Structures are given as structure tokens and as C-alpha cells.
Write a protein that binds this ligand. Structure first.
Ligand SMILES: Nc1ncnc2c1ncn2[C@@H]1O[C@H](COP(=O)(O)OP(=O)(O)O)[C@@H](O)[C@H]1O
Ligand SMILES: Nc1ncnc2c1ncn2[C@@H]1O[C@H](COP(=O)(O)OP(=O)(O)O)[C@@H](O)[C@H]1O
Ligand SMILES: Nc1ncnc2c1ncn2[C@@H]1O[C@H](COP(=O)(O)OP(=O)(O)O)[C@@H](O)[C@H]1O
Ligand SMILES: Nc1ncnc2c1ncn2[C@@H]1O[C@H](COP(=O)(O)OP(=O)(O)O)[C@@H](O)[C@H]1O
Ligand SMILES: [Mg+2]
Ligand SMILES: [Mg+2]
Ligand SMILES: [Mg+2]
Ligand SMILES: [Mg+2]
Lengths: 151, 151, 151, 151, 128, 128
């Protein structure tokens, strides 16, 4: 019964500013299915791998330390088109360019404090999910209202 | 003053997923006036006429079938530019193309389970409202703060 | 498959103050099932019958005229214990004695403007539902998530 | 400073009815600190131990069976008086006796589908937290505005 | 008609934790009328407070009910202190405990210029 | 650090329709800092307005985005005008259109005493 998945994380600013439930609420209200979830303080080296494609960018060392500075909520969300749709729901990388109604549009201001992460593509999602989740931490179950979300 | 009216329906998935109140609340908040409301399981005959323009589309027979599967909330809403504005508030026909902040943007995933209907034009609204409501079932009244909504 | 029902109405102040959706939202969120709904401007004589047991009270003539002064949303809600549970959700007859968290506790101030009505007992509900609803206006359907509300 | 901790679980009906975010959001809003969170379909063995005190109750075997039917959200929350206060926020064991404003008061109907669990005491919390979480899975951190929550 | 009035303040912890709008929304939703509002660091004085005067039938006692008990521990869910805080020294909001207190507190915090006379157009749907 | 500041007013239709708290909650949620607040009938003057000064990086243009277009008809859902109103003459809120406008509007509506200097303790989670 399996459907596309993506990796979503509430960043340390999201946790510190009390937005975990508000963020999850939006993904539930959309009809997406929660397949995995954990709360951790990730190591700086874990984040260096998560953001490996950015290793040469000037903000990278500070981004990885920052993302390891507090707990994060790591999540796997599942549904048709969830990878691209979640990005839409978050807004742009820069909150300044994110529209009201989006998570970043509604809740934050700066690119370095943009509360949330979502995979940018299916292949990125597959890598990120495997990096953060062990296979047994991914739950298979079926939403009773699946009939009303998918024909 | 009598203003423009549109026909809005909460589809069976919208009723089943408990979004009636949320949808009505968005229209009240916007400033529009409720002019008619009933709750029915519509006949397939009625829906075939409702969607008569799409009678040759592949999805037509399934659409009408599905829209008559359960109760819907049928509404008439009144206010300046309410036809085009209600459509903006719902989003695009496909939720995948709808923006966060809109009803479909926030709440659903698939074009076949897109929780709500709105007339696409004034002429469409005139036909639909007459199809769903008897004249005696429409309510004319004046919002006390209508002067804070309209100059 | 039938379960207890009650009659709930959004009074004219509830409609005028934009609380229809907020009220319905609360009954949906609770797990109750919407069985019937209509929007009407009820006659003063209909209300005189609705409130017949109060015919000798000083506020009665003014209460019946008032309740016929604007549109009301008439509803039948269904579920285990719904009659008594809905009253709890509304608060006391007097908003002054209704606790925050209740509909009257949150949204109004005076006994004569207390936004909502609910049947006080099963026998009252049976009478009120029959007075306001024709039998065909009552919808039989089954909430897909009934399994998660009732064991 | 290390403060009191409690074990809180979103039950399978709570997950299925899309109330994860809403529940977490209430605990964040109150000022409590998230100290642990995982998402699992628990073994029936684990639940039999979780509820071991109720092993002779008629509802016990069905309870454990049901709690292992789907994924639950397992949580550790931290703060002054969090054990007794979390229980207040959920309501009474039976939703019928729970007040509007509480989680069960707002969201459910039956004692067997009462969406959430909280430890009934500190000693119960110590056992439950150890049963559901390995030491390495609990997160110690400091809320930046903790000084606006505690003097 | 000028109705009963009470003093309500969002305390510095209320301002710091971003609860100003949430508190105001509750009093507006209830049907009470905002009569006065300012934002000041008074000369507790650990930061800005929102000082307010709300007006309506029985607003003094009702606003206290809406806040919850003095201690959040004794405050019920649905109330402001019940939903949003934990400790007695960090209980986010203040409300006058009587008409006399209210009258004194209003006079202390507000100049008469700062109490605005107006009528909610929906007043006839709130007050008989 | 003193950051950029803009003038925002809840218009009389905004006050009359009970949207003050809702508007404030949006600016608090976004992470902007309330710098000044009053409530007055200015000498449009058809009733009370809530006058505010909000502070943060890019607050002038961002607050305009949060409001939506000048006309609610062109305002998108999610925005204040998009969610809550219909006509251009009843568009509930005002925001300065530039830093220069903001500076002038703030000076016009607020005395320097009424701009409170403070720091959100969560500032380090909003600003790098
Ligand atoms: N110019 C920048 N300055 C500081 N931080 C940045 C910048 N660009 C990106 N970041 C941070 O790095 C994270 C990952 O970057 P990237 O993968 O490019 O964006 P996204 O999160 O949209 O996929 C961003 O979410 C943001 O927190
Ligand atoms: N390609 C499609 N496949 C399935 N159902 C569709 C498709 N396109 C439209 N529908 C359904 O038919 C309904 C009516 O179509 P249409 O009138 O074109 O759109 P709208 O609802 O936006 O007015 C849509 O709301 C949608 O639920
Ligand atoms: N003392 C009173 N003064 C004015 N109106 C009243 C009074 N008591 C009751 N009412 C109005 O009459 C309605 C019906 O009264 P009743 O059936 O006694 O209360 P309830 O609505 O709780 O069943 C109330 O909801 C209220 O609007
Ligand atoms: N009489 C009952 N019938 C069915 N299930 C029950 C009954 N009483 C309790 N339960 C279930 O067992 C759970 C555990 O019981 P208990 O520990 O007594 O209550 P609480 O959950 O409030 O701590 C309850 O939350 C409820 O879901
Ligand atoms: Mg990237
Ligand atoms: Mg169409
Ligand atoms: Mg009665
Ligand atoms: Mg127990």
C-alpha cells in the first residue's frame, strides 16, 4: 500500500518557539499520513551528512552546529506528491519570500532561523529518511479516512 | 441592497472528514452573508444536472455517483464578488495546484476528493442555486455590521 | 444503526455575530454526527410552540419575537449521550454561570442573548426535532471514523 | 534544574482522528517541556505491562489488544506538577465526565475511545517512562523562555 | 450606555511568550468592548505590559472567571491561566478583583483621555 | 539591536468586527516585536483605532505582505485582508509602505516615550 514519502524536521528554533504541534497539525489536516517520528538531539556530524551537498557554502559549518544545538523532531510523512507538496506548505527557503499561509510565511523571518526542513526531491527524501530513521522506526498502517482522501 | 450570490457545497469527503464548520467559519470571517443552507444526500439525477456541462468528461459518471454517495452541505452565500472570491478561497480545481491558505491548499490532496464546490460564474450560480434551493428556502436579512464590510 | 439525537439551534445573535461554523466545528470535533440541518427564518408562532412550556414566563413574548427576528440554523446532532453532552458543551442557560471552554462561556454574556439552544432531555429533543424537521430532512449515513469514536 | 516528568500517549484513535498536533500544541502552549517522543505500534506484551495494575478488570484484555492495534505517539513531558496537571488537561477517565476545555471534553465520547493516556502519579510515570523509553532516547535541554514560565 | 469596566493587564511573561493577541481575541470573542489600551514599562517592571480597560455587563467578575484562579495549578482548562501557564509568579495576566479595585486601577493606569467612548454596532446582539 | 520599525493600525472596521487580537496574534506568531501600542480616536475618525509599532528585520515590506494587497479582492487567502474582508474602503488594517513613511507615521502617532525598548528572550531563535 505504499505511497511516496518525505523527510520533515522541526528545527531547533521550531522546538524552542513551541511550534511542533502546529506544524504536525498542518500535515494531518492536509491528509498526509505520519509514517515515522522521533525526537532527538542530533550530532553535528549527522547534520554534516544531511546537508552534505552544501559542504562548501559559507553558512554550512554554522548551519550544522546550529541544527545540533537543540532537539529536533524528525518525521517521515507519506502521501501522493508529499515531497513537493510539503515544500509548498513550508514556503521558500527564505521566509522573506514565503507567502502568508505557509509555515515559514506565518511563523518566521530569517533564512538561518526558518523553523522547518523538508526533502527537496524523492531521491533526497530516500537518503534523508535512511539517514535519520532505522527501517523498523517506519510504521505501516492505514488511515481509516483514506477513502475520503484518495479515490 | 441585494448583492451577488454563489452556490457552495461541502462535498461528501468534506462532511466525512469533519470540515463543515471550518469551511463555514472561513466564509463568515471573510464577511460574506449566508443566504441559504440545507443538508441532503442528493439524487444522482440532480448531480448529473448540476454537472451537466461536464457530461462527456471521462470522470463525469464517477463524479455524479460519488457526489451522491453521502450527505453534502448545500449553501447560498451573498456578497460583492462572492462568485470569483469564493473560488479564490477554495483554491484551484486540483488541490495540487492550490496554495496554502486556501481550503483545498490546507485540507486535501486529490482532484477527486477536493472537499468543496463553488459556482464558476454568476450564470452558473443562478442555475445551481435554483437547482438546489426553492425560492421559499432562501433567506434575506441584513448583517448588523454590514456597514463595516461595505462602504 | 440509530443513536440518540438532539435538536441544536444557532440563535439569531449567533448568526449575526458570525459563530455558525465555530459552533458546528465544536460538535464535529467532539465526534458527534450531523443528521439534519437547515437555515430558516422561523415564524414567531413556531417559536411559541418550541418554547411552549415557558408561555407564562415574563420573557416569553420577547424571547419568541427575538428568535424570529433573524435567521437561525436548525440542527439535529446524533451520538451516544448527545442530549446531555451538548448542554454541557453549551454551558448553563446564563452565560454568566457558564465556564470558559463552553460555547456560552467563550462567546456571550447575557441570558437573553445566549447564542445557542439545545434540547434539555430526550423527550424534549424528540418533540423539537419533529417540530423543526420533516422526517425526510433527517439524513441517515455512517461516519467512516465511527470505529474510532465508538468501540 | 530537573523538573517532574510524566508519560503521555496519543492513543490509536487519537492518531487515526488526526489529533496528534492538537494534543502536542496544548502541552507546548501550557509551558511544559518535551523530553521524549517516539511513534510506534506497540507490542501487546508491552501494553499488558503498561496496564498491569488493571489486569483483572473485564476491559483489560480488550484494552491491551486495542492499544496495540495501531501506532501511538509516546511522549515524555517535563515541568512542575506535570503529572497531575496533564491529567487535568486531558479530563476525567470517562469523556462523559470531562469538561469542555479538556482534551477528552472537546474531542471524544466513550471511555474506550478516549484518545489519550497520562500517568496517574510520579511513581507510575517513572515506571511508564522507563518502559517506553531507553535512557539514551530522553532529551535534556533548556527552554530559552523557561524564566518566563518559572520564577 | 456606559457599562461596568475592569482593568486587565498582560504581564511581562504574557508579552514575552507572545500571548497578547490570544488574550485580546478571547475578550473580543466574549463580546466585551475594548475601552482603553496602552503598552508601557511601568515604574513586574521587568519589561513591557499591555494595560487595558474592558467594558460590559459584569466584566469585573467575568474577566476573573475567564482568567482562571490566581494560581494556574487551580485554574481549569479553557481559562487563560489554565491553558497557558504553570506558576503563580508567572501567571501572565491580571484582572481587577472588584468594581472598586477596577475604578482605582483604571484611574491609576489610564488618563481620562485614554478611555475611548464608542458603541459596538453588534451591541444589540450581545445586550438585550 | 534596534531593528527596522513600521506603523500598523487596526482600522475602525477592524476594531468593530473584533479582529484586533487576531491581527496582533499574527504579528506575534511571525516573530516580530511589539514596540508600541495605543488606542485612540484620531482627529477614518469614525471610531477607535489600534495604533502599533512593530519591529524586526524587513518588517515594513513583510507586514505589507502579511496584510495582502491594498484591495482585498486582490489579496490572497492566508493574508489578513484575504481572510477577513471584501472592499477597498473597508480593508481593516494599515501598514507603512516604506521605511521613510514608517518613520514619519511612527513620529506622528507615537511620542518617543511610547516606544518601549526591550528584548524578546527568544530573539536568538528568530535572528541569527
Ligand atoms: N544564504 C543562506 N544563509 C544562511 N543560511 C542558509 C542560506 N541558505 C540556506 N540556508 C540554510 O540551510 C538550510 C538548507 O539549505 P537548502 O537545502 O538550500 O534549502 P531548503 O531547506 O529549502 O532545502 C536552509 O533551510 C537554511 O536554514
Ligand atoms: N480530472 C479529473 N478527474 C476527476 N475528477 C475531476 C477532474 N477534474 C475535475 N474533477 C471533479 O469534477 C469537479 C467539477 O469540475 P470543474 O467544474 O471542472 O471544476 P471546479 O470544481 O473547480 O469547478 C471538480 O471539482 C473535481 O472534483
Ligand atoms: N430570566 C430570563 N430572562 C430572559 N431570558 C431568559 C431567562 N431565562 C431563560 N431565558 C431565555 O429563554 C431560553 C429558553 O429558556 P430555558 O429553556 O429555560 O433554558 P435553556 O435554553 O437552557 O433550555 C434561554 O436559552 C434564554 O435565551
Ligand atoms: N470501564 C471501562 N471500560 C473500558 N475501558 C476502560 C474502562 N475504564 C477505563 N478504560 C480504559 O482503560 C484506560 C486505563 O484506565 P485507567 O488507568 O483506569 O484510567 P486513566 O486512563 O484515566 O488512567 C482508560 O484510559 C480507558 O481507556
Ligand atoms: Mg538542500
Ligand atoms: Mg464546476
Ligand atoms: Mg426549556
Ligand atoms: Mg491509568
Amino acid at each position: 500500500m505504499v505511497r511516496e514519502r518525505t523527510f520533515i524536521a522541526v528545527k531547533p528554533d521550531g522546538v524552542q518557539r513551541g511550534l511542533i504541534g502546529e506544524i504536525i497539525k498542518r500535515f494531518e489536516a492536509k491528509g498526509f499520513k505520519l509514517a515515522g517520528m522521533k525526537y532527538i538531539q542530533a550530532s553535528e556530524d549527522l547534520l554534516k551528512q544531511h546537508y552534505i551537498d552544501l559542504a562548501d557554502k559559507p553558512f554550512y559549518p554554522g548551519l550544522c552546529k546550529y541544527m545540533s544545538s537543540g532537539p529536533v523532531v524528525a518525521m517521515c510523512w507519506e502521501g501522493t506528491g508529499v515531497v513537493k507538496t510539503a515544500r509548498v506548505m513550508m514556503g521558500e527557503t527564505r521566509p522573506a519570500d514565503s507567502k502568508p499561509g505557509t509555515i515559514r510565511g506565518d511563523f518566521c523571518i530569517e533564512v538561518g532561523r526558518n523553523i522547518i526542513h523538508g526533502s527537496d526531491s524523492v531521491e533526497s527524501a530516500n537518503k534523508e529518511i535512511a539517514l535519520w530513521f532505522k527501517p523498523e522506526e517506519l510504521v505501516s498502517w492505514t488511515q481509516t479516512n483514506e477513502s475520503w482522501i484518495y479515490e
